[PDB]
Amino acid sequence: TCPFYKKIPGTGFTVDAFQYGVVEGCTAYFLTHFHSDHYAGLSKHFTFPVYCSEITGNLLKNKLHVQEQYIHPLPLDTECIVNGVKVVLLDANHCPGAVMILFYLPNGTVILHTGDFRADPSMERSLLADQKVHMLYLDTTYCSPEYTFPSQQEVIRFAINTAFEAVTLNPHALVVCGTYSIGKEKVFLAIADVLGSKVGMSQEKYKTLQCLNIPEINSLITTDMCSSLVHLLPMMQINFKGLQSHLKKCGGKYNQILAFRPTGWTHSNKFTRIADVIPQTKGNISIYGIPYSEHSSYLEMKRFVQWLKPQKIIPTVNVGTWKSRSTMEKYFREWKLEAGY
């Protein structure tokens, strides 16, 4: 059965609710982004209308085989009528194709569902500037002050400089980057660009990247591993064993691996600056954990919510424990008393 925080009152609509079977009363199922916890349940057998971005639509058709007649893509930043209700889709600054959804309810209430997002000041000049929001359904992944991490630009600067240094000292080093979902593509794209290489990967991952409308993608990626000195591998293989095993396969072309594991936040964020990060090393293999986040920091989240001034907040992450729910409600009240709404 579908939980309450996935239902939009006063509508026939649900958000990210495909794992509960046929939901009673649902005439349109919205999908915010192509991450498995959110699409869990969709397949080629699905026969209800799905509303989403163009990119999410390309992935539902090609990767999950949902039939074309049930895929309803909407443009961003554009007022659209769905089953008699005005909606708008906004870029969520998460993974490719990820949206926030603004719903303009027939009774005059306005609801924003963030999906998963990384709040940014640029959102203060979207179609959100124009009007009031009564209810915010908020991605609270990192809603606690201990959750700090750098900008995505600083992280990419660290990775480019690390890779370029290592390969210039040793032209026989291979760079490997882990992945397990869409998102974070800038890590491997920026490293390959500095090195003058395409990115090599499996046929399955190439297929996924080809759904994402990235400009000039044919110039940036390939299935021919041998021609490439930046390889992608599943995240589970980014360990000393997996990487040793991979270096054997390259036919004595390389004598060193430098690998990157983009994570979210990890506790080493509490003590170490991005500048000061060091790898784990065994022999000719080195592994860097880099804190590339596609979710809001606590400070970015606080800023967004204090700017929007919603009348009510409904969290969509960390909702399963009393202690989590209580902690989050405390911070929402501080924010509201500090800013005066």
CA 104 vs. chain centroid, Å, equals 26
Cβ-in-10-Å burial (0-12, 13-18, 19+) of 240 comes to middle
CA distance 108 to 124: 22
Question: Considering CB under 5 A, how many residues would be counted as binding Ni ion?
Answer: 2
Return the SS3 of 39. helix
User: Contact letters (x/-) for Ni ion, 27-66, by CB under 5 A?
Assistant: --------x-------------------------------
Nearest to Ni ion of 123, 259 (CB atom): 123
- The residues in 65-104 that bind Ni ion, with binding defined as CB under 5 A, are none
- The residues in 291-320 that bind Ni ion, with binding defined as CB under 5 A, are none
- Min. distance of Cβ 116 from Ni ion in angstroms? 4
- Min. distance of Cβ 118 from Ni ion in angstroms? 10
- The residues in 128-187 that bind Ni ion, with binding defined as CB under 5 A, are none
How do strand 221-222 and strand 199-200 relate by DSSP bridges? parallel
Structure tokens at 141: 């992944």
Q: Please say whether the beta carbons of 104 and 85 come within 8 A.
A: yes
Per-residue 3-state assignment (H helix, E strand, C coil) for 108-125: CCEEEECCCCCCCHHHHH
User: Contact letters (x/-) for Ni ion, 3-22, by CB under 5 A?
Assistant: --------------------
- Min. distance of Cβ 114 from Ni ion in angstroms? 11
Stretch of residues binding Ni ion (CB under 5 A), selected from 81-89, 112-120, 163-171, 249-257:
112-120
CA distance 294 to 304: 15
- CA torsion, ordered 219, 163, 236, 181, to nearest 10 deg: -40
- Min. distance of Cβ 169 from Ni ion in angstroms? 37
Q: Choose which of 16, 116, 185, 300 interacts with Ni ion (CB under 5 A).
A: 116
- Min. distance of Cβ 117 from Ni ion in angstroms? 9
Nearest to Ni ion of 99, 174 (CB atom): 99
CA distance 45 to 223: 30
- Min. distance of Cβ 94 from Ni ion in angstroms? 6
- Min. distance of Cβ 184 from Ni ion in angstroms? 11
Stretch of residues binding Ni ion (CB under 5 A), selected from 47-55, 109-117, 120-128, 325-333:
109-117
Token pair 């919603």: residue: 310
- The residues in 245-284 that bind Ni ion, with binding defined as CB under 5 A, are none
Residues 6+ apart with CB under 8 A from 330: none
Nearest to Ni ion of 115, 289 (CB atom): 115
* Helical (H) or strand (E) element with 247: helix 240-249
By the criterion CB under 5 A, which residues form the site for Ni ion? 35, 116
